[PDB]
């Protein structure tokens, strides 16, 4: 049945709740972003109002064929009225089109739902600064102190420098980058830009990217793999067997592959700095796991919450085990005692 942490009290609303059939009492279904664990359930046969960003609405129409009459895109940073309730969509610093949602309940309670987010100090200057938030529905994906990672900027500097050095030493090397969803576009686009190439990809992935309102995108991507020396493949193909096979397909144009897997966290982070990352190599194939995250680190999450000072926190991730739930609740209490709220 629909879990309580997907329902907004005092409303008829749900968030990211498309796989439970008709949720009893739901008058508007919000969708924070286009990732499959959140949209699971949607299709051309859905006939209730879906509220989302413009970008998410482009993906719903083009990729899932949801009918236009049921898609209600809202502008960001703008007070809107939905079924009699004031709402605002904020940038979540997650994947393209991802939002946080502020609900202003008729009784005066204010609720923020983060969806999936990567907390940032820039959020401390949005419309969130303007009033008190009472209840926080929090993306707790990496809510434990072991989870550190570098800035996105540090990670892209590493990737760009590695790629440029490799291809300048060997102009016959091919760069491959893995993907299995939207998000992390900066990895492949920044590498193609330093090399003077477009990124080559499947027709399906090209279609997906053309829904994202990225500026000048026609100049950066292509379905012509032969004209490109940065290729995008499914994340499942980023292994030695899959890469050897791909190299065969390129007909002796290339003699070396340098591949990137943008993981979330991996326990090489507890020890290793970004400067010290090394690849796995077999023959003329090397594979780099880089820690490019679109979720908050522990410290980023903690700073956001201690700034916001909510009265009640409802986790939305890692809620399936009692040990995880109890650990998170202990951190929330530490944060509150340290900060004084
Ligand atoms: Ni997500």
């Amino acid at each position: 049945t629909c879990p309580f942490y997907k329902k907004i009290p005092g409303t008829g609303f749900t968030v990211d709740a498309f796989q439970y059939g008709v949720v009893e009492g739901c008058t508007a279904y919000f969708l924070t972003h286009f990732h499959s664990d959140h949209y699971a359930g949607l299709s051309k046969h859905f006939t209730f109002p879906v509220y989302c960003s413009e970008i998410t609405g482009n993906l719903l129409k083009n990729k899932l064929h949801v009918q236009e009459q049921y898609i209600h895109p809202l502008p960001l940073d703008t007070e809107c009225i939905v079924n009699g309730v004031k709402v605002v969509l904020l940038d979540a610093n997650h994947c393209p089109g991802a939002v946080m949602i502020l609900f202003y309940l008729p009784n005066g309670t204010v609720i923020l739902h983060t969806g999936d987010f990567r907390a940032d100090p820039s959020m401390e200057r949005s419309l969130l600064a303007d009033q008190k938030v009472h209840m926080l529905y929090l993306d707790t994906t990496y809510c434990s102190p072991e989870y550190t990672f570098p800035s996105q900027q540090e990670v892209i500097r590493f990737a760009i420098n590695t790629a440029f050095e490799a291809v300048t030493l060997n102009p016959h090397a091919l760069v491959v980058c893995g993907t299995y969803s939207i998000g992390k576009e900066k990895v492949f686009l920044a590498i193609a830009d330093v090399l003077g190439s477009k990124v080559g990809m499947s027709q399906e992935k090209y279609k997906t990217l053309q829904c994202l309102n990225i500026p000048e995108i026609n100049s950066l991507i292509t379905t012509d793999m032969c004209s490109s020396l940065v290729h995008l493949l499914p994340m499942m193909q980023i292994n030695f067997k899959g890469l050897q096979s791909h190299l065969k397909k390129c007909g002796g144009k290339y003699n070396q592959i340098l591949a990137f897997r943008p993981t979330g966290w991996t326990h090489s982070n507890k020890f290793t700095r970004i400067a010290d990352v090394i690849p796995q190599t077999k023959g003329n194939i090397s594979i780099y796991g880089i820690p490019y995250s679109e979720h908050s680190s522990y410290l980023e999450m903690k700073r956001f919450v201690q700034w916001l000072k909510p009265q009640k926190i409802i986790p939305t991730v890692n809620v399936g085990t009692w040990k995880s739930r109890s650990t998170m609740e202990k951190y929330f209490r530490e944060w509150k005692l340290e900060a004084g709220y």
Side-chain angles (χ1 to χ4, degrees), residues 1-23 25-203 205-215 217-240 242-247 249-269 271-281 283-311 313-341:
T1 72
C2 184
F4 73 100
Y5 64 81
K6 289 186 183 278
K7 297 167 157 193
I8 304 303
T11 72
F13 302 155
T14 59
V15 180
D16 301 345
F18 297 92
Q19 66 167 297
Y20 305 102
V22 180
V23 175
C26 189
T27 65
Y29 293 77
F30 283 78
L31 177 62
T32 61
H33 64 294
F34 197 78
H35 281 164
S36 62
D37 280 356
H38 301 258
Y39 64 73
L42 278 162
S43 75
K44 71 171 72 173
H45 307 293
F46 199 81
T47 52
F48 300 102
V50 175
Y51 288 84
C52 64
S53 69
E54 174 184 356
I55 282 159
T56 298
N58 294 343
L59 290 157
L60 287 180
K61 179 190 171 184
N62 289 288
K63 299 295 294 188
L64 302 181
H65 305 292
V66 169
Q67 296 170 45
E68 205 136 42
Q69 79 177 128
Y70 305 112
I71 303 172
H72 300 260
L74 315 170
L76 300 197
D77 299 317
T78 302
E79 297 184 327
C80 296
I81 305 311
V82 176
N83 299 356
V85 176
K86 184 161 69 167
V87 306
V88 173
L89 303 190
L90 308 167
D91 205 280
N93 188 40
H94 185 55
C95 64
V99 300
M100 310 194 288
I101 312 155
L102 254 187
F103 301 95
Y104 292 83
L105 266 38
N107 81 355
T109 299
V110 176
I111 292 176
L112 179 64
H113 197 304
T114 68
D116 283 344
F117 85 144
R118 185 164 186 180
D120 191 73
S122 63
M123 294 172 174
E124 303 162 17
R125 297 169 278 283
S126 60
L127 297 198
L128 281 178
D130 297 27
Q131 77 294 284
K132 191 188 175 50
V133 173
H134 307 89
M135 306 180 74
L136 177 63
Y137 288 62
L138 180 62
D139 167 17
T140 45
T141 296
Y142 296 126
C143 189
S144 201
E146 63 274 31
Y147 299 112
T148 60
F149 29 66
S151 69
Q152 295 175 163
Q153 191 271 331
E154 292 173 72
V155 177
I156 289 309
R157 180 102 289 220
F158 174 82
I160 288 174
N161 289 358
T162 301
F164 180 73
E165 170 182 305
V167 177
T168 299
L169 293 168
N170 184 190
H172 299 276
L174 174 64
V175 178
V176 181
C177 289
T179 183
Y180 43 31
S181 57
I182 68 167
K184 308 189 188 181
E185 290 78 8
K186 195 68 168 173
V187 180
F188 52 89
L189 296 178
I191 291 168
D193 175 81
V194 84
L195 299 176
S197 184
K198 297 195 186 179
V199 183
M201 63 194 68
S202 75
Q203 291 179 252
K205 184 74 185 180
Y206 184 87
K207 175 181 184 181
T208 298
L209 300 187
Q210 283 291 166
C211 300
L212 310 181
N213 293 352
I214 285 171
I217 198 60
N218 295 335
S219 68
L220 320 165
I221 62 171
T222 187
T223 55
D224 185 356
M225 314 288 285
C226 295
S227 67
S228 159
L229 59 143
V230 181
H231 299 175
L232 298 194
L233 298 181
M235 197 74 87
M236 290 194 67
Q237 201 170 355
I238 313 299
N239 51 68
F240 299 115
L243 291 164
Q244 279 162 208
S245 174
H246 185 71
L247 191 55
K249 285 160 243 164
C250 297
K253 204 160 204 304
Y254 306 106
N255 65 357
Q256 176 179 17
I257 283 173
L258 186 106
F260 297 86
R261 295 185 339 85
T263 61
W265 166 85
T266 62
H267 186 67
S268 344
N269 270 309
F271 313 115
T272 312
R273 270 171 150 74
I274 192 72
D276 318 333
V277 165
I278 66 174
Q280 274 193 236
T281 298
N284 62 335
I285 302 177
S286 296
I287 300 173
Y288 286 89
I290 58 173
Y292 191 91
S293 183
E294 289 188 342
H295 296 274
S296 311
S297 74
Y298 174 85
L299 288 171
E300 293 167 343
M301 190 191 301
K302 177 179 182 276
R303 177 187 168 120
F304 178 82
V305 177
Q306 290 181 310
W307 170 81
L308 194 73
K309 307 179 170 61
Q311 296 173 2
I313 300 175
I314 302 179
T316 66
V317 187
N318 302 315
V319 296
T321 83
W322 299 115
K323 191 180 144 213
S324 299
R325 283 195 159 283
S326 173
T327 302
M328 292 183 295
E329 293 176 357
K330 288 176 30 263
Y331 294 128
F332 306 146
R333 191 53 61 171
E334 293 177 13
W335 302 350
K336 175 184 169 72
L337 286 167
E338 181 187 33
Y341 51 100

